[PDB]
């Protein structure tokens, strides 16, 4: 906890989750999850533009579940991902480990694929301009 | 069409509210409350707020509950991801789900399936009868 305002989490395929947490008005130690997800996974669609996310986070044992619908002004992939997992802030690195489900289409055979993503916190790069570094 | 009441095979109830996303075409933000009725679980019979997103284009959804409210805490979170079928006599939502929790400093994630069916408000003549 005390990842504060906006924080940056990178998974093993280079995908980026920018979480924002707002306290739930009614749920003890629970925060509403907002922000944006940037998909960077190699063989996929809907890459490199922000998809808003929605979810909930329980600080008591640092658990989370969030979702993306893959529709925004750049690209539509007509699907939705739900991620559910837990954090470990200890040591030199903060890590979020997740299992996931994807409501999907092949033809009109609707289905749901499953998987795993592990994210690691990485704090903003500082460059002294947009043109250097 | 979807303010609407969806009942799963354990008697658990999802009351969805949908508000249009300002930036995502054919996408709605999912709010409302979830009431858990599942037999061998905690955190039963009280409202847990839910959060998610819904894509109208092919009627797909993903939503979440953190199992913490004023009645009961179960220190976990469920995420549900699936699709609707409005056709026929009955509207049905079919989902897969994942559940993050602890067992003894031991993080773990269980999974399963829930199928929900729409049922619109029953009308009684009063609270006392009929």
Give the domain ranges of chain A. 1-133
Report the distance separating Cα B125 and Cα A12, nearest Å: 58
**How far is Cα A49 from Cα B24, in angstroms, rounded to an integer?**
12
In this complex, the residue of A26, A54, A80 whose CB is nearest that of residue B60 is A80
Q: End-to-end CA distance of chain B: give it in Å, rounded.
A: 28
Q: Do A112 and B82 touch (CB under 8 A)?
A: yes
Task: Say how far apart CA A120 and CA A87 lie, in whole Å.
Answer: 9
Helix (H) or strand (E) holding A108: none
Interface subset of A 55-74, CB within 8 angstroms of B: 55-58, 60-61, 63-73
Rounded CA separation A105/B82 (Å): 11
Contact of B27 with chain A, judged by CB distance below 8 Å, is answered with yes
For the domain made up of A1-133, give the CATH fold.
Answer: Lipocalin (2.40.128)
CA A16 – CA A69 distance, rounded (Å): 15
Instruction: Report resolution in angstroms.
Output: 2.4
Determine how β-strand A109-121 pairs with β-strand A7-11. Answer: antiparallel
B17 touches chain A (CB under 8 A): no
Q: Is residue A112 a contact partner of residue B98, using CB atoms and an 8 Å limit? A: no
C-alpha span between B4 and B17 (Å, rounded): 7
Residue A74, number of CB atoms within 10 A of its CB: 11
**Strand B4-8 vs strand B13-20: parallel, antiparallel, or unpaired?**
antiparallel
Q: Are A29 and A61 in contact (CB under 8 A)?
A: no
- B65 DSSP assignment: E
- CATH number for the B1-130 domain, one of 2.40.128.30, 3.40.50.300, 3.40.50.720, 1.20.1430.10? 2.40.128.30
């Amino acid at each position: 906890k005390l990842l504060a305002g906006a924080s940056n989490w990178v998974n093993q395929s280079g995908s980026v989750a920018q979480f924002v947490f707002t306290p739930s008005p009614t749920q003890p130690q629970t925060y509403e999850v907002s922000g944006n997800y940037i998909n960077n996974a190699q063989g996929t669609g809907c890459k490199g533009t922000p998809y808003p996310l929605s979810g909930a986070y329980y600080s008591g044992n640092q658990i989370i579940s969030f979702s993306v619908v893959w529709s925004n002004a750049s690209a539509n992939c007509q699907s939705a991902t739900g991620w559910t997992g837990y954090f470990d802030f200890s040591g030199s690195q903060a890590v979020l480990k997740t299992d996931w489900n994807l409501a999907f289409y092949s033809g009109s055979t609707p289905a749901i694929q499953q998987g795993q993503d592990d994210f690691m916190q990485s704090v903003a790069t500082v460059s002294e301009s947009l043109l250097t570094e």
